[model samples]
Target: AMARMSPADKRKLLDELRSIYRTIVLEYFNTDAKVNERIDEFVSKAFFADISVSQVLEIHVELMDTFSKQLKLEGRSEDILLDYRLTLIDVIAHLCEMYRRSIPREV
Candidate 1:
């Protein structure tokens, strides 16, 4: 899919991803309040970015790790913890669909 994008669009996507990463590190990740909301906003914007499948997978891992650490601090029940992780995985999968839709197809 990335191969279908022009160089300029690819650069724009990369810049957007970098901005998202910075926002997460400096604000969302630092704060416990409204984490899901902030992340939802990030995912919405990322829907327009020309991300590759590999990039989405990589980002998924980082998000999972970050959220897992945060979840551990909550000391929730095992069932709730499992639910949180599963829900996050579902959200990440939806975000990857955004990338897929953003890329143009050759056919």
Candidate 2:
């Protein structure tokens, strides 16, 4: 059996994956509409089975941690950042709910 990952290892993996997202987003912006549609189709097919409620919540939680850490490490915050924080919380809550619905057994 595979060993369970520590949070630190998970964070490292997520940080690496963010680079790939950045690359893809940059490439996506440079594509035409038909190319963008094809890219979205490919992504949807590739990731259709990747979602699970727990995994979704874990990803969001890890992202929140990563974002906060990066912000502090960079030592900068705008005075209007409260709105950004509130919107993040809202997104996190929505993702949590979406994940909860995927559970096979109700609590």
Candidate 3:
């Protein structure tokens, strides 16, 4: 479905998506009002851009893998990054809500 996105669009999509993940992890990795609003915007683009939720999960995996390796080199513990799962779940929750609202349910 993402086949329709131009290379430029794909770059922008991943850029913002990854930033949200990173930002969420930088703290206690919990969601707040500002983050939630930004996530709503992210989900709108992701919803329309046709990026599956798997990509969302994959990005977190990709980032954590890199962080793990990099942290090892820095003599830091990878355990610090594990809490990012909270960030992942928060974003996915918002994304799922977007999917729910877009359905054309017959009453």
Candidate 4:
């Protein structure tokens, strides 16, 4: 599906993902309650019918994991960032798995 997307559409989707990633980081600092609620709200608002939500989630997870790896390599050693990164990865992964299962399987 990514191969089928026009360059314009791909660029738009990348922009949306970046925006969503920023929102997650910002909201993480502002709230201590219901982590999933904040994440779900941001994810839903950032994406809709324009792209597959599961694919968007996967991109988010991939981008975040890569960022985390870079940070670790730098020897920054921040537990907070690691914790939040892992949390987001797990939450998004679970959501993606559920979404995949809900889709109809082609015989």
RMSD of each: 7.2, 8.5, 3.6, 6.1
- TM-score of candidate 4 on Cα atoms, chains taken together: 0.47
For 6-92, candidate 3 gives per-residue lDDT tens digits of 888787877987776565566443454465556666677678877789888998898878888889899898777756676678778
Instruction: Give the clash count for each candidate.
Output: 0, 0, 0, 0
- TM-score top scorer: 3
lDDT of 4 by residue, 1-107 (tens): 23565788767756765665555655666656555565675455444424455655576567667667877898765565665566566556645665677589889
TM-score-sorted candidate list, best first: 3, 4, 1, 2
What does candidate 1's lDDT look like per residue over 1-107, in tens digits?
34566778777766666555435434543456665554566577566453454664576466556656776887644443444355446556767766678689999
**Model 3 misplaced regions, further than 4 Å:** 1-5, 27-33, 70-79
Q: Global CA lDDT of candidate 2, please?
A: 0.45
Report the Cα lDDT for candidate 3: 0.74
lDDT of 1 at 10: 71
**Model 4 whole-model lDDT (C-alpha atoms):** 0.60
lDDT of each: 0.58, 0.45, 0.74, 0.60
Candidate 3, residue 24: the lDDT equals 52
Best by lDDT: 3
Candidate 4 off by > 4 Å: 1-5, 32-38, 41-77, 104-107
lDDT measured at residue 20 in model 2 versus the true structure, 0 to 100: 34
Q: In model 3, what is the error at residue 88, expressed in angstroms? A: 1.0
Clashes of 3: 0
lDDT of 2 by residue, 1-80 (tens): 24765778666544544443323334433545343443343233224433333443454455456556777888866433
